[PDB]
């Protein structure tokens, strides 16, 4: 009947942030750390192997070194928590924790990762000064795949051309718009993706003297 309990079986965590994952195990009176054993794993990858108050660091995975730690402090309350920071995307997947202290049980938990596209990069250039043909360009990086919607100041949608591609596994999304326009005409690109439905809208203001390429 000795059982391990996880307060949350889900984690939706944004790229590069930090998260603590929690496991709970019965403790009465004071915790004997000689007799405590913890293991943290993610798919085929060990993460921590904590035997006898001493965390075995020869065996932790390469991809985790100096990133994810077992908080040694909470344990005394029966809470053995994995602390990872700078959530790296390839951490998305199913973890599971295993506690042998007098008895043993394990519970698995999963975590997925977002990466909003909220830093948008603009470029505005003329390609044909006579026809006033300009080229509006938004790019941005995130996870999972995104799509790009172009809109005129008067809120009409317009046809763009976009390219999705990879950075590590990150998505790089470029979209350009070729439309005749003049100075001080404002246009918008909004980046909309799925998963945790999210959107980020940039404003592009045509300059009097745009560059050309």
């Amino acid at each position, epitope marked *: 009947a000795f059982t391990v309990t996880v307060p949350k079986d889900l984690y939706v965590v944004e790229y590069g942030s930090n998260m603590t994952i929690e496991c709970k195990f019965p403790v009465e009176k004071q915790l004997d750390l000689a007799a405590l*054993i913890v*293991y943290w794993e993610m*798919e*085929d*990858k060990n993460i921590i*192997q904590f*035997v006898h108050g001493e965390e075995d660091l020869k065996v932790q*995975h*390469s991809s985790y070194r100096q990133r994810a730690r077992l908080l040694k402090d909470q344990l005394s309350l029966g809470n053995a928590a994995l602390q990872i920071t700078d959530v790296k995307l390839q951490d998305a997947g199913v973890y599971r924790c*295993m506690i042998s202290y007098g008895g043993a049980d394990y519970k698995r938990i999963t975590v997925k990762v977002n990466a909003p596209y909220n830093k948008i990069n603009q470029r505005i250039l003329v390609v044909d000064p006579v026809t006033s043909e300009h080229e509006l360009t938004c790019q941005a990086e995130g996870y999972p795949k995104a799509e790009v919607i172009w809109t005129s100041s008067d809120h009409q949608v317009l046809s763009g051309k976009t390219t999705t591609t990879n950075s590590e596994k990150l998505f790089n999304v470029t979209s350009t718009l070729r439309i005749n326009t003049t100075t001080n005409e404002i246009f918008y690109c909004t980046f909309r993706r799925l998963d945790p439905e999210e959107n980020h809208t940039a404003e592009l203001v045509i300059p009097e003297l745009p560059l050309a390429h």
Partner: antibody
């Protein structure tokens, strides 16, 4: 610089008992996940049992659940498999496989086996 | 539960050859952990590559590995006659288990 020596297998009746051992020489065996893997003659190779270094966490393949039990003495740096009421389908070669550090499931070094015949 | 490896392939010296390993959305096609093992008959299986392509120090560059979608492939180059042996692939699985392949027997 590493050796894994299976010993104890032989001819036993169906329903009998056999204790398979694995002598382990090599890296610090108190830190490794260890495993048993069986090869039926000519056939594919299947995983039977896992054991974590310490804490006594073990795992068994569904065919084998309940009549096989695995153990390990981290001082004597060896590994055992107790086989009870051997069925007829349980007759195959038995390998003792060390799990590469970091990786939960990936063996790297193996021993040469020992025969079990039902 | 098994990984399907075509049992019969073969080829002559100084040549390239590719064994195939296929499996489910839940094991070889879902994870980047697939390991390949080389053994001559009645001998001591040798890890050759791991984690889809990675090979440990001490395996000739003549061995690389590849995973395309659901299907994974072990390639031998500069092929020689010692390398004729039963070879197996393997993968982690959603059950936190390693499935192994039926094995292929390459012959020089």
């Amino acid at each position: 610089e590493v050796q894994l020596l299976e010993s104890g297998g032989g001819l036993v009746q169906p329903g009998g008992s056999l204790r398979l051992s694995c002598a382990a020489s090599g890296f610090t065996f108190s830190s490794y996940i260890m495993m048993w893997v069986r090869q039926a003659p000519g056939k594919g190779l299947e995983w039977v049992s896992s054991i974590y270094p310490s804490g006594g966490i073990t795992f068994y393949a569904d065919t084998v659940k309940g009549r096989f039990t695995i153990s390990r003495d981290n001082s004597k740096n060896t590994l055992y498999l107790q086989m009870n009421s051997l069925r007829a389908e349980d007759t195959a070669v038995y390998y003792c496989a060390r799990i590469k550090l970091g990786t939960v499931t990936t063996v790297d070094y193996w021993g040469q086996g020992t025969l079990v015949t039902v | 539960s098994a990984l399907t490896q075509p049992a019969s392939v073969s080829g002559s010296p100084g040549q390239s050859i590719t064994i195939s390993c296929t499996g489910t959305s839940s094991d070889v096609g879902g994870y980047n952990y697939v390991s390949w093992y080389q053994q001559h008959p009645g001998k001591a299986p040798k890890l050759m590559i791991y984690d889809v392509s990675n090979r440990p120090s001490g395996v000739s560059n003549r061995f690389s590995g590849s995973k395309s979608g659901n299907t994974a492939s072990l390639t031998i180059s500069g092929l020689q006659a010692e390398d004729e042996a039963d070879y197996y692939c393997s993968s982690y699985t959603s059950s936190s288990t390693r499935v192994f392949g039926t094995g292929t027997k390459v012959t020089v």
